[PDB]
């Protein structure tokens, strides 16, 4: 019996400021605006990425800029969100699909991959009656290559070895695109991160449903 | 004389609600979320789509759930939702600017296909003074074929035998790739959709017009 | 010390109306839907595009209407909006995501370019209340190559002659298929606009504070 649609005139505010607060990651994080991104975070914040695994919001954004200092090139496209709110117990679940878009080069061959998902911003409104989110973590559902020059068939030999069915089997269907091309670049993968094929699903949204009661929650799986 | 831009401050509200209504297709029809997608419409809201013809949104959705089921694999990426507002009759037309992304697999090679579209939701608000959408169509805008492996020649010819122009020509231009991935998969296409270069967008623009002004419509060509 | 998120009810439903504006360009100039996209800015607004460089709001909608009849395909997916309120001087700025997805043809084989960028819009609240832009410049971020019909490899030989390295290399980073691809079409190209590149970034951000702060600007460089 969450607000989601319609609603009072408070109710759509508070779906309004949560709404803006997801989408701070595709506008502030790819410009590395990184104070307006803190904002969008309690202190005490915890994100899980596929390329960091567990942090919390000072380490994601430390290592986020040691990252694109090092020429790591992600951007986010925001793809349609929309806010559960719980107005009893000030809390709600920002939901903002998006395609992580992410630069790479092989054997002098630039691509991207592509990977589309739900980020999931858990959220409250804090002592100063501030919308905040406390956890992120993200449903990982699809993904591809992507060519970026023209796709001749000697260029995309090359890129073929990088692919190969046994690498990409190496991850959860999902991010498989995503992790391979990640994992050649140098960072450690977390492959316990939620899809719409594995288990972790389940346990995502069970997480999901405790916390709009108002409850603590813990993602750190 | 549409209310669109700046307003006053309940046509913006107004304006808000329509908007993540429709924004609703993205996020709750690709996550399952079926009574979250309900509300969206009013009991006996009228939907079209290429592979489902006219549905009502009950039909529609249980059609949905069987496809899915299935196998059936559609996403939405929403890319820009505007409303045009009228406060005098409590009729407000949503423009929805989408992708709809199906993955596909052909002779074993997986692909997408991704169509640019217009979600248009025809919309009034009810006896509660909440929006809902009374009928749902599509403005189909322009089709690609998206490869999601690396596209090595040999995959690339197998898949060009069913993408064949005798094959695309059989589809209004603004779907012809979706249509002919969704036909294979064995699914009927409704012809009779609106796109950027047929005459259905007059008939499309001229029952928008009489939705604005209180009057009633119908879609059912 | 901008509002951005959160803030009073005030400065939500104003960065509500902000964002919508932005978003205008993506919904209204796709659609052709010019009284719509003309209300979007002040009377003489200015405007910077790749192919049509500086230009009035007016001379804008007529070359672009020009361009249209002549073939022109250029569509918008909004890919994450947010603003930058200073409620002091009641100016304010959109950043407003977006993909340029131009579609061409090449020897009989169609494509896109897409083009991943911010649209930036300098705003204000005129003397009725009202939020327009006066200034719209973009910056460019990156590009690439998409295929429309599968991509065998006759078809990408013709392709690669185009869009040679030599030929890309003569525009700035971030925008370079999509210059080659309109250049080829007849279209001049700007090639002193803002990339995350170049030192016009720099430029950019110093005149987006300077309107935060109430000054007047002039982005013609
Ligand atoms: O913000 N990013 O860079 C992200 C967020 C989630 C991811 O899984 C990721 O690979 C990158
Ligand atoms: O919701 N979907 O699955 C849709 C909506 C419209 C379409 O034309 C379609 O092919 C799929
Ligand atoms: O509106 N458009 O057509 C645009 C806007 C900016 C561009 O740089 C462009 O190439 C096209
Ligand atoms: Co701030
Ligand atoms: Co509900
Ligand atoms: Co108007
Ligand atoms: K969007």
């Given at each position: 019996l969450y607000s989601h649609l319609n609603g009072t005139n408070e109710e759509v505010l508070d779906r309004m400021k949560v709404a803006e607060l997801c989408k701070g990651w595709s506008v502030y994080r790819?410009?590395?605006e990184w104070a307006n991104f803190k904002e969008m975070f309690t202190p005490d914040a915890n994100i899980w990425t596929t390329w960091s695994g567990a942090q919390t919001i000072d380490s994601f954004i430390q290592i986020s800029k040691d990252g694109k200092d090092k020429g790591a090139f992600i951007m986010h496209r925001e793809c349609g969100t929309l806010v559960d709110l719980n107005p009893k117990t000030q809390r709600a679940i920002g939901?903002?699909?998006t395609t992580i878009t992410q630069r790479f080069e092989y054997e002098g061959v630039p691509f991207d991959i592509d990977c589309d998902n739900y980020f999931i911003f858990?959220?409250?409104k804090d002592s100063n009656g501030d919308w905040k989110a406390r956890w992120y973590k993200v449903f990982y559902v699809k993904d591809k290559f992507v060519p970026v020059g023209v796709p001749t068939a000697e260029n995309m030999e090359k890129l073929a070895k990088l692919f190969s069915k046994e690498n990409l089997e190496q991850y959860p269907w999902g991010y498989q695109y995503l992790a391979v091309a990640q994992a050649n670049?140098?960072?450690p993968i977390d492959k316990k991160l939620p899809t719409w094929k594995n288990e972790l699903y389940h346990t995502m949204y069970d997480a999901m449903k405790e916390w709009?009661?108002?409850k603590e929650i813990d993602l750190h799986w």
């Open positions: 790819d410009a590395s939901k903002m699909k858990f959220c409250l670049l140098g960072y709009m009661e108002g």
